Amino acid sequence: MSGPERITLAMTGASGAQYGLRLLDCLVQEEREVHFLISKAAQLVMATQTDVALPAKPQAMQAFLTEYCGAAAGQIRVFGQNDWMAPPASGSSAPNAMVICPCSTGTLSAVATGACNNLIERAADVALKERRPLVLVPREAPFSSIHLENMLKLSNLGAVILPAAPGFYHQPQSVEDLVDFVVARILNTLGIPQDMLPRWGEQHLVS
Amino acid sequence: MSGPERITLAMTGASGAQYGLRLLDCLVQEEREVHFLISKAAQLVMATQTDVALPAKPQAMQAFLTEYCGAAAGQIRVFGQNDWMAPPASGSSAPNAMVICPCSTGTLSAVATGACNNLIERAADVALKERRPLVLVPREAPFSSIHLENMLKLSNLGAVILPAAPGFYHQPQSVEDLVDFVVARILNTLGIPQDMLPRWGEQHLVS
Amino acid sequence: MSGPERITLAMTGASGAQYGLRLLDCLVQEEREVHFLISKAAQLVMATQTDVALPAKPQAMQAFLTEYCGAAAGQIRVFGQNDWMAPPASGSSAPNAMVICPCSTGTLSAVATGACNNLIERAADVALKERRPLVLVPREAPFSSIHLENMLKLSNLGAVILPAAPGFYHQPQSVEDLVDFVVARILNTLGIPQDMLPRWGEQHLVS
Amino acid sequence: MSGPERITLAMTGASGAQYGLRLLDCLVQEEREVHFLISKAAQLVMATQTDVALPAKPQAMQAFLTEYCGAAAGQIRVFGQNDWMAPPASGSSAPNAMVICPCSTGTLSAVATGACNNLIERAADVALKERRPLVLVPREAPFSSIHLENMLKLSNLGAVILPAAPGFYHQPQSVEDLVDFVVARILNTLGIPQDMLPRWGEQHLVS
Amino acid sequence: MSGPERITLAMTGASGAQYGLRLLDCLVQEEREVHFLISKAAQLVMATQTDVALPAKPQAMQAFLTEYCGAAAGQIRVFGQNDWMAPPASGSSAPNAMVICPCSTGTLSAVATGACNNLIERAADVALKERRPLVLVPREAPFSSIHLENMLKLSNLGAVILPAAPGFYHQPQSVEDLVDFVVARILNTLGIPQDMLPRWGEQHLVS
Amino acid sequence: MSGPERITLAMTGASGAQYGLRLLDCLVQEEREVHFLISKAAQLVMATQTDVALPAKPQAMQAFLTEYCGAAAGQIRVFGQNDWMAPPASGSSAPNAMVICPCSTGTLSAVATGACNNLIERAADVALKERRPLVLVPREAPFSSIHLENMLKLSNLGAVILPAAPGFYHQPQSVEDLVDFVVARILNTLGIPQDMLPRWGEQHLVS
Amino acid sequence: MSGPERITLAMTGASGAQYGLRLLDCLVQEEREVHFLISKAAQLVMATQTDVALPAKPQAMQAFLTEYCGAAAGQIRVFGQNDWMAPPASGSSAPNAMVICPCSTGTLSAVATGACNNLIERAADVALKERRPLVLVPREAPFSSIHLENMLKLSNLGAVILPAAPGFYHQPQSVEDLVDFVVARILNTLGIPQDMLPRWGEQHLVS
Amino acid sequence: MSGPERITLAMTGASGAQYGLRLLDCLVQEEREVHFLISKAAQLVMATQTDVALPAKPQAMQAFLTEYCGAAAGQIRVFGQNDWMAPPASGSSAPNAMVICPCSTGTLSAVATGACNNLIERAADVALKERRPLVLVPREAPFSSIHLENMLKLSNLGAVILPAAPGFYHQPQSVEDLVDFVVARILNTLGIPQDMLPRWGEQHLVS
Ligand SMILES: Cc1cc2c(cc1C)N(C[C@H](O)[C@H](O)[C@H](O)COP(=O)(O)O)c1[nH]c(=O)[nH]c(=O)c1N2
Ligand SMILES: Cc1cc2c(cc1C)N(C[C@H](O)[C@H](O)[C@H](O)COP(=O)(O)O)c1[nH]c(=O)[nH]c(=O)c1N2
Ligand SMILES: Cc1cc2c(cc1C)N(C[C@H](O)[C@H](O)[C@H](O)COP(=O)(O)O)c1[nH]c(=O)[nH]c(=O)c1N2
Ligand SMILES: Cc1cc2c(cc1C)N(C[C@H](O)[C@H](O)[C@H](O)COP(=O)(O)O)c1[nH]c(=O)[nH]c(=O)c1N2
Ligand SMILES: Cc1cc2c(cc1C)N(C[C@H](O)[C@H](O)[C@H](O)COP(=O)(O)O)c1[nH]c(=O)[nH]c(=O)c1N2
Ligand SMILES: Cc1cc2c(cc1C)N(C[C@H](O)[C@H](O)[C@H](O)COP(=O)(O)O)c1[nH]c(=O)[nH]c(=O)c1N2
Ligand SMILES: Cc1cc2c(cc1C)N(C[C@H](O)[C@H](O)[C@H](O)COP(=O)(O)O)c1[nH]c(=O)[nH]c(=O)c1N2
Ligand SMILES: Cc1cc2c(cc1C)N(C[C@H](O)[C@H](O)[C@H](O)COP(=O)(O)O)c1[nH]c(=O)[nH]c(=O)c1N2
Ligand SMILES: CC(C)=CCOP(=O)(O)O
Ligand SMILES: CC(C)=CCOP(=O)(O)O
Ligand SMILES: CC(C)=CCOP(=O)(O)O
Ligand SMILES: CC(C)=CCOP(=O)(O)O
Ligand SMILES: CC(C)=CCOP(=O)(O)O
Ligand SMILES: CC(C)=CCOP(=O)(O)O
Ligand SMILES: CC(C)=CCOP(=O)(O)O
Ligand SMILES: CC(C)=CCOP(=O)(O)O
C-alpha cells in the first residue's frame, strides 16, 4: 500500500465539517486505520452545519462513525480531548500521518506556539518532533498577519498548509464536487490513492 | 453610498474565474464604476472552466461584459496589460479600491516584490504606495512557504489577503452559494452593501 | 527501481548546456520518463556553445532529442514555455522530481520569489508546494549576495542547491569527465543509479 | 529491512558513553553496518566513567568492539579523526544515517557552524549537504542560549536534536533501563526496529 | 543561609515526577519554604509512574506532602490552579525563586508566550517581570524547533533551561543516583547547598 | 570580602600580556584564589613583548607565578589546555568569575559560537551556562563586523565586553598607569576593591 | 601622494584627546589639508586632561592649532558646530576622508541613527551617503550592547570602527608610544604614509 | 601595474588544487609577490589528485615552487600554519589581496565565524578588518544552508565568493581550459591582467 497505514484525523471548530467527514470516509475506503479526534467547537459546527448527528461520548461516537462509513471493527478509534493514554500523545507510539481538517485559527495558533492544551494540540506537537506528516486545512477569510505568521512558521518546519480552497479545473457541478477536490488534494499530500481528481496533463505528450 | 465609487478589478490565472465574474456582476448592481483588467492566463482559465466566451481585445471585451452584467454605458472600463495611459497606472489618478480576484501565486509574488511588469502589477504597486484598498484573493493549495511569506509581507503592509475559502455556515446548496459566500466577504471588506450573507448573530441579544 | 520514475528537466540560460544534455542522456539510459523544458535563452546558449542543433518548436525538439538519446517513443515529453496544459503546471499532476540544469541566476531568482512567469518557474513553484524534489544547478561566478540569499532561502525550504562545481578526486582527463562528475552528483541526489563516480571509501575498512 | 543499512556512529566527549555503547550493540544486533568514530575527549570519558577498556588505535579498537558486541567481520568499521579516505568524508559515499551519541556542546557548535575540523564534524557537514539523516544526542545541563541557538539552527535544517533525557513512563528499575529508553528513541528516529520501549497506546481502542 | 528562603515549585505533566518529588524533599531538608503547585496532567503522571498516592485537593495534598517529607507545619504551602489569592500570582508578593520541575512542552510554550492560563503560568510570568529566578526542567525527546525556540526565548530573558539530562561522571549505580544528579544541578543553580554531587576538580591543584 | 573568592584568569594571544599579568598580581594581593590558564599563542606573546620568562609546563609555571606575585601556596592553580579534570571544565565546580585578559579575536569567536576546543573555551562555555561572571578583554583594531557581531552576541547574553581601551582622565604618566586603568576597570566589574582609579566625582556635592 | 588630500578631523568628548592632537600633527606633517571640528564636551576634555590651552572661538582656534602644529596658512580650517556653510555639511563638497578621534558613545549613537544635530554628526551622515571614508575611534570600557549594535551597524555600512586599543608588539616605553600606535593604525586605514609602526613581518621570507 | 603588488594565496583542502597551482603560476608571470600558505588537508589533496610532489616543510616548499613556476628569488614566500611572525598575521603589515583557492567548507566556516585557528584563518580575519581584498573559491556540491549562510555573511561584508564553477562560453577543449576560466575570473576580480578569457562583447557595437 502506498501512503500511511494509520492517520490521526482531528476535526476542529472551523466551518468546514464536510471536508473532515468526507476525508474520514475516503480513508476508511482505502482500508486505513483512523485515530479520530474532535474538539468541542467542532461538535457544535457539525451539529449546526451538517445533517450528521454525532454522539457526544467517545464510545458512542466510534460506533456511529463505524456505521456512517462502513468501517471494519476497530478501524476507527475515537479518543477524547484529555486521553493521554491514546497513541497520538507520545512520540513512542507507532508512526502515523496527522491531518487537522478543518483546522481552526485557534488550533493553528496552538500548534505554531506548542501549547499542547488538549490531545489534538499535543498530537500535532508530537508529529512535529517526530518528523511525521502533519497537514493543516485552515478555513478562514481574510487571513490576518497572525494567521499567516503561524502558517509560515509551520510550513517552514515541514507541515503542509492546505487551505480549504477548491479549484474549478475539474468542472465541478455540486458542493460535493468542491468538497471532493479538497479531499483529493489531502490524499495526494499523504500519498494515498484517489480517483476523484485526475492527474493533470497525464495524457498530454507535447506542446 | 458606503464604500468606494470605483473598483479596479483584476482577474489573474488562478482556477477561480467564477468568483471574479460574480464580483463584477455584484459591483455593477451596486452602481459602481469598475476598471477591469485581465491577464493572458486568466483568459485561458475563463475559456476552459467557464461557459463565458470572452472576447480577446479590450473594446470587444468591454462591450461583452457590459451586456453580460447589465451595466450602464461607461460603467465598466477595460484596459489592456500595457496600457499605461489608464488610471490605475498612476497614483495621480482618482482613488479607487483594487481587488485581484482570483490572484495567482505569480501575481501575488509580483505584488509582494514590486515587479510592476504589466498593468495589474503596477496598479497594485500604486494602491500600496497610495494607501488605497488592495484585496488579494488567492486560490492555491497547498500554500508553500514562498506563498505564505509573500502574503504575510503584503498583509503587514495593509493589503487584505482573502483566500477563496468559502464557509458552510449559511447552509450552501449549490456551487453558486459557495461562490457567493466568497464574494460577500469581499464586498464586506470593501464596505459595499451585500445581502447574500446575513450579519452573523445580529438578532442574538443574550447568551 | 530506486529513485523517481519521472523527472522534469528544465534547461535555462546559464553557460553549461553540456550538463543538462548529459543528464538527459543518463536519465534516458536509466529508463526514466523525462518532461523536458527549455528557455529561450537556454536555446541561444546551446546554439553557441555546443554542437547540438536543437530544433525550435516542441514537437521537432521531441523528435530530435528522442534520436539524440536513443530514447523510447514517448519517453521524453517536450513542453513549451506557456503550455499550462502540461503536467508540471499543477500539483494535481503525477509526482516527479524536478531538476533545473543549468539554472540561470534569473531562474534562481524567480523560483526564490515565486514569480511563476513561464512553465519552468511555475513547475518549480509546484515542486515546492508539493514537497517534491527540486534540484537547482547554478553556473555563475562570483556569486553575489543576491544570488546567495536566493539560494539560501530555497535550501532552507528543502531545495537542493548543487552548483556546477566539479571535483578532481576521480582523476579527470577530459571536459567530459568533469561534466560527468556533476551529472553523477545530480543522480546521486535524486537517488538514481550511476557508475560514473565510485562510492568514496567503500572499500576502506580501517584507518 | 526497515531503516538504514549503514549508520555512522560518532561518539564525542559528553558524559554519556553508556548511550553510544548501548546503541552500537543494538545496531549490531539488528545486523546493520556501523562506521564508528570517536573523539579524543570521548576516549577520556569512556576510560573514566565506564568499565570498557577501549584500545587507542583504530585497528585495535575495531577488533575490541567486534568482540564486545558480537559483530560479524567487517560489520563495524573504525576510522580515525583525520582519515579523509573514509566514506563519511564525502557526499559521493554510499548513503548512511549519522548519529552523534553523545554529542558534546563543542561538537554541536562545530556542526552548527560548519567547522569540519575532524572526521566527525566533516561527516555531519556531509550528512547535512546530502539531506541524509543526522541525529544529535546532547548531554548538558543547563543548556545556555549558545547551545540552544546551535540546536535550533540544526533542527531547522532537518537534524534531529534528541537530548539524553530519559522518560519514566515504562517504569524503569535500573540505570540500564534509562539508557535503553534513550537508545529506543534513537532507533525509532532512525526507523530501526526495537523492543525495549513498547508503542504507546497501541492497545487502547477508545477513551 | 545561601540561596532563596522561599521556592515556588511547580510540577507539570512531563514524565519525570521523581525529580520534582526529590527536589521537594531536598528543599524541605534545607529548611526552605516551598509554595507547591501541580497541574492536572502532572497528577496523572505521578499516579501512573510513581508509588506516591497524592491526594487531589490542596489541603489534603499539603498534609500528605508535609508527612512525606518530614516538613515543619506551614513549611509547604499548596495552592490550586486558579487560586489567584496565592503569593505567586502577583509581583507584589515576597520574592521567591521558581522552579518548574518537570516542565512539560505545553508549560514551556505558555511561559514563552505569556499565556498565564493558570497559576503556574502566571507565577512564571511574574518571575520574569520581577527578574526573579526561574528554572525550567524540560523532559522531552526529540526536542522540536518549536520547543527549542521557546527555550531560547526564555534563556535569552534570563530563565535557566535545565533539561532532565543526567550525567554519568559521579558513577551512578541506581535510578536514584541519576535523579539526584539532576536535583543537585537545580540546587546549584538556585545557590542552595547540596552534597549529592561533589564540586568538580576542587582538589586538583595542577595539570 | 566583596567580590568573588575565586577567579579563572585566562590569557590568550592578543598583544596585551601586561594587562593579564598586572591583573594576576592585583588578584593575588586581594587574597583571591586564581585558576590560571594560558594559550600557546599567549605564551609566544609574553615571550616576545614582555620581560617575563614564563616556563612552559603547568607545574613550573605555577611555581614561577607564585614567586612573581608573592602568592601563598596553592593560591594560584595552573591548568593546561586539555586538562578536563580541572574545575573550570564543569558547571558542577565551585562558582568562580572568569576573565579572559587579553582575549584574542579567535577566542572571542570560539566563545561566541560555543566551540569548546580547549579548556579556556570550555571554561567560558560553562560560565555562560551557569550564569557566572564572564569578562572578555579584547585588544584589536580595527574591529571588523565579525568581531563586533561576536561581541554583541556575548554582551546580549550577559558577558562583559571590556576592551583594552584606557582612558586619560586620571593623568597617566607612564605605560604602567595605562595598564592599571584597564585593570582597575576589570576589578570594578568583578566587584573587587581597587585603589588605582579613584571613584569619579565622589567628592562633588553640587553642580 | 597616497591617501586623501583632505581629512575632516572631528574631536568629540571621549577621554582620549591625545590621540586627536597627535593625529592632527601627523596629518599636517604629511601636508594634508585638515577640516577641524570639535565638540563642546571635547573642549572640556582637552582642558582637563591635557596641557593644551585651546581657544574657544573658531578663528582663535585655527590660529592656535596652526602654530601648535607648524602648519601652513589655510592648511587647517576650523568650523564651528552649526556652521552649515562649511564643506562637510554637503555631499556636493570636494571629497575628503573623515575621522572622529576620539569618538564618544554619544557621537557614535548619532552617526548610527542619522541624528545630524551638529556639524560633526551631519558631516558623518554625508560621508556615509557619499561612500567617503569614515573612521570612528571610540574610547569606552565596557562597551555595552547599545554601543556594540551602533558599531556593528556602521561597520556593516563600511565605516571603520578603530577602537583606541593600542598593542604592545612594538615595545612601547612611554604613553606617547601607545598614542602613536593608535595614530599609526588610523593613518594606515586612511592610506597615508607613516613611520611610527613598522610593517609587520616585511623582512620575514620563510617560516 | 594594475592590481595588487602582493597576493596572499592560501590553499585549503577542497578538491581543486589545480586552480591554486595555476593561479600561483599566473601571479608569478605577472611579476607579483605571493605569500603562499597551504593547509595540511590541502597537502593531502595535492598529493592525491595531482602530479605535483610538494615538499612538506616551508623552506623546501619555497624552493620547489620557485622552480615550478619560474619565479624570481624571494618572489614566493612560504609561511607555515602557526607562523605568527609572517606579514598576513597582522593588520600592520603591508597591504596585500588575499585569495583562498580552493577554499574548503571548513575554512569558509572559520572565516565567517572569525575562528583564527591557524595562519590562513587569521590572515582572512585581518583582510576583513583592514578592508583588504578577500576572494574565496569554494569547491563543494551540493552547498548546504550552512555553507550558503557562511558565504552570504562574507559576501555582505565585502568578500568575493567565487565558486569553482567554470563556464563554457569560450569553447573549452580540455580540463586545462576549464581551470584557466576560473583562474581568469579570479585575476579579473583582483584587477590583474589576463589573456586567457577575452572581454565579452568588446567588439560588438550594436544590437
Ligand atoms: C458555527 C461556528 C463556526 C465557526 C467557528 C465557531 C462556530 C461555533 N469558528 C471558531 C472557533 O470554533 C473558535 O475560535 C474555537 O475556539 C476553536 O476551538 P478549537 O480549535 O476547535 O478547539 C471558526 N473558526 C475559524 O477559524 N474558521 C471558521 O470557519 C469558524 N467557523
Ligand atoms: C487552467 C489553469 C489553471 C490554473 C493555472 C493556469 C491554468 C492555465 N495557474 C497558473 C498560472 O495561471 C500561471 O502560473 C501564470 O503564469 C499566472 O500568470 P498571471 O498571474 O495570470 O499573469 C494557477 N495558478 C494558481 O496560483 N492557482 C490556480 O488555481 C491555477 N490554476
Ligand atoms: C551565451 C550566454 C551565456 C550566458 C547567459 C546568456 C547567454 C546568452 N546568461 C544569461 C541569462 O541567459 C539571462 O540573464 C537570461 O535572462 C536567463 O533567462 P532564463 O532563466 O534562461 O529564462 C548566463 N546567466 C547565468 O546565470 N550564468 C551564465 O553562465 C550565463 N551564461
Ligand atoms: C570527564 C569529562 C566529562 C565531560 C566532558 C569532558 C570530560 C573530560 N565534557 C567536555 C568536552 O569533552 C570538551 O568540551 C571537549 O572539547 C569536547 O570535544 P569533542 O566534541 O569530544 O571533540 C563534557 N561536555 C559536554 O558537552 N557535556 C558533558 O557531559 C561533558 N562531560
Ligand atoms: C503519562 C503522561 C506522560 C507524559 C505526558 C502526559 C501523560 C499523561 N506528557 C503530556 C502533557 O502532560 C500534556 O501535553 C499536557 O497538556 C501538559 O499540561 P501541563 O503543562 O501539565 O498543564 C508529556 N509531555 C512532555 O512534555 N514530556 C513528557 O515526558 C510527557 N509525558
Ligand atoms: C606576537 C603576536 C601578537 C598578536 C597575535 C599573535 C602573535 C603571535 N594575535 C593572534 C592570535 O594570537 C592568533 O589569531 C591565535 O590563533 C589566537 O589563539 P588563542 O586565542 O590565543 O588560542 C593577535 N590577535 C588579536 O586578536 N589581537 C592581537 O593584538 C594579536 N597580537
Ligand atoms: C572629562 C570627561 C571625560 C569623558 C566624558 C565627558 C567628560 C567631561 N565622556 C562623556 C561625553 O563627553 C558625553 O556623553 C557627551 O555628551 C559627548 O558629547 P559629544 O559626542 O562630544 O558632543 C566620555 N564619553 C565616552 O564615550 N568615553 C569617555 O572616555 C568619556 N570621557
Ligand atoms: C582528498 C580530499 C578531498 C576533499 C577533502 C579532503 C580530502 C582529503 N575535503 C575535506 C576537507 O579537506 C576537510 O573538511 C578539512 O578539515 C579541511 O581543512 P582545511 O580547511 O584545509 O584546513 C573537501 N572539502 C571540501 O569542502 N570540498 C572538497 O572538494 C573536498 N575534497
Ligand atoms: C503520553 C506520553 C507517554 C508522553 C511522552 O511521550 P514522548 O516521550 O514525549 O514522546
Ligand atoms: C503612468 C504614470 C503617469 C505613472 C506615474 O505615476 P506616479 O507619479 O508614480 O504615481
Ligand atoms: C494548470 C493548473 C490546473 C494549476 C492548478 O494546480 P494546483 O491546484 O494549484 O496545484
Ligand atoms: C574526502 C572527499 C573526496 C571530499 C569531497 O566530497 P564532496 O564532493 O564534497 O561530497
Ligand atoms: C493577583 C494579583 C494581585 C495580580 C497583580 O500583580 P501585579 O501588580 O501584576 O504584579
Ligand atoms: C569535565 C566535566 C565533568 C563536564 C561536565 O560538566 P557539566 O555537567 O556539563 O556542567
Ligand atoms: C549644507 C547643504 C548645502 C546640504 C545639502 O547637501 P546634499 O545635497 O544633501 O549633499
Ligand atoms: C601577529 C600580530 C602582531 C597581530 C596584531 O595585529 P593587529 O594589531 O591585530 O592588526
UniProtKB/Swiss-Prot annotation, chains A, B, C, D, E, F, G, H:
Gene3D superfamilies: Flavin prenyltransferase-like (3.40.50.1950). Changing residue 169 to F: Severely compromises catalytic activity. Pfam families: Flavoprotein (PF02441). It catalyses: dimethylallyl phosphate + FMNH2 = prenylated FMNH2 + phosphate. The keyword Transferase applies. FMN binds at residues 13-15, 39, 104-107, 116, 139. One of its GO terms (molecular function) is prenyltransferase activity. Its EC number is 2.5.1.129. Dimethylallyl phosphate binds at residues 169, 185. InterPro entries: Flavin_trans-like, Flavoprotein, UbiX-like. NCBIfam families: PRK06029.1, ubiX_pad. Belongs to the UbiX/PAD1 family. This is Flavin prenyltransferase UbiX. It comes from Pseudomonas aeruginosa (strain ATCC 15692 / DSM 22644 / CIP 104116 / JCM 14847 / LMG 12228 / 1C / PRS 101 / PAO1). The lineage of its organism: Bacteria, Pseudomonadati, Pseudomonadota, Gammaproteobacteria, Pseudomonadales. The gene is ubiX.
